Amino acid sequence: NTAVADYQKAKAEFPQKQEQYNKDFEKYQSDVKEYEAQKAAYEQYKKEVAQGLASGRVEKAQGLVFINEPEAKLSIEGVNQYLTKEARQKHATEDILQQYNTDNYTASDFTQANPYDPKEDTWFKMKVGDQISVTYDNIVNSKYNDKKISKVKINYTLNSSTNNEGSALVNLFHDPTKTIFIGAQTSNAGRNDKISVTMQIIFYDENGNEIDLSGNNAIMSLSSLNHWTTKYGDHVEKVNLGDNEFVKIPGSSVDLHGNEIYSAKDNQYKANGATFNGDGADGWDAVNADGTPRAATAYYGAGAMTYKGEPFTFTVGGNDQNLPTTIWFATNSAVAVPKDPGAKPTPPEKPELK
Numbered sequence: 001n002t003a004v005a006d007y008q009k010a011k012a013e014f015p016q017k018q019e020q021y022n023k024d025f026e027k028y029q030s031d032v033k034e035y036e037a038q039k040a041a042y043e044q045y046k047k048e049v050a051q052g053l054a055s056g057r058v059e060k061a062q063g064l065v066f067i068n069e070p071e072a073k074l075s076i077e078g079v080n081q082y083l084t085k086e087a088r089q090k091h092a093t094e095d096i097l098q099q100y101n102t103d104n105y106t107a108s109d110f111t112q113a114n115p116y117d118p119k120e121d122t123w124f125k126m127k128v129g130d131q132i133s134v135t136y137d138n139i140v141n142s143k144y145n146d147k148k149i150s151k152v153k154i155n156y157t158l159n160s161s162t163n164n165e166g167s168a169l170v171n172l173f174h175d176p177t178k179t180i181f182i183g184a185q186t187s188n189a190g191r192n193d194k195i196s197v198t199m200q201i202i203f204y205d206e207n208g209n210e211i212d213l214s215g216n217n218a219i220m221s222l223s224s225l226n227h228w229t230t231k232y233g234d235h236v237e238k239v240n241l242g243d244n245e246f247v248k249i250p251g252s253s254v255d256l257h258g259n260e261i262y263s264a265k266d267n268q269y270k271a272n273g274a275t276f277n278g279d280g281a282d283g284w285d286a287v288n289a290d291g292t293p294r295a296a297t298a299y300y301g302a303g304a305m306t307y308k309g310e311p312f313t314f315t316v317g318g319n320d321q322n323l324p325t326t327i328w329f330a331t332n333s334a335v336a337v338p339k340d341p342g343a344k345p346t347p348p349e350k351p352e353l354k
């Protein structure tokens, strides 16, 4: 006989069980909406692949494997201001936005002689209008149309900055599939300056010749094109593809607008109308240190291109004054597409005393 104890426990716990139910039910309603969006995008993508629609080229046309090059080493031409290792150390514990606050660095933090080994990530300031050329070798995992890739060259040119010094701070990864993390102070009010970088990638075969991409099999990612709108900015990340060709990702917030691809509306906060939240461990934009997306919903912030070997330009701007502008821009063969969301969420069981 435990009737009294059991009755009193069930009665005492009921308010908490009801509060947990309300939270679980709200979460279920939110999850159903996310599931329906993911399912629609996945079904559309499957149809595009099966029927041979344009976006099916992500699967059907891909001949480029260029996703992971953790052994690559760098040779850099055209950089005149490398960040000293002492200055890198001094800024390493700061918030990311402060690490890229160019107001917090002075001339004594930079040197003309590169202190970084070829095998490690390298830091430097870029100067508007000065093209740099980065050659990456020790390429072990990559190929294009069954031509193993021996080397990659990427040229980068800073066209504009958000600061008033014509400069931006860069962390250049030794693995070229991680590309570049760039930022600067946002020195002016008015949301109208931007960091703009033109890039061009050349792949080389085992005999050292440049690889012709005109079979149109190099499908490259343009993921993580955030657009957030808050009291602190109308921050938009964009790509001008130049002579390369846009590949629309089904269900993505990113589309073609004249000359550029980006998300026309906020894609970062459900509170601002986005379908998925971008922030946090569970957000669509979550990434590992390797740059790999953590989220099956990464497609929501992504575009892609058929890369034809010609220059393209990424931009980021719209922050308010004094909030440093940053972007981790990567491009590689790992296009973010909708994935199978699994089974539809089921509602929580309502707690009862009966």
Ligand SMILES: [Ca+2]
Residues within 6 Å of the ligand: 223, 224, 225, 226, 237, 327, 328
């Ligand atoms: Ca981004």
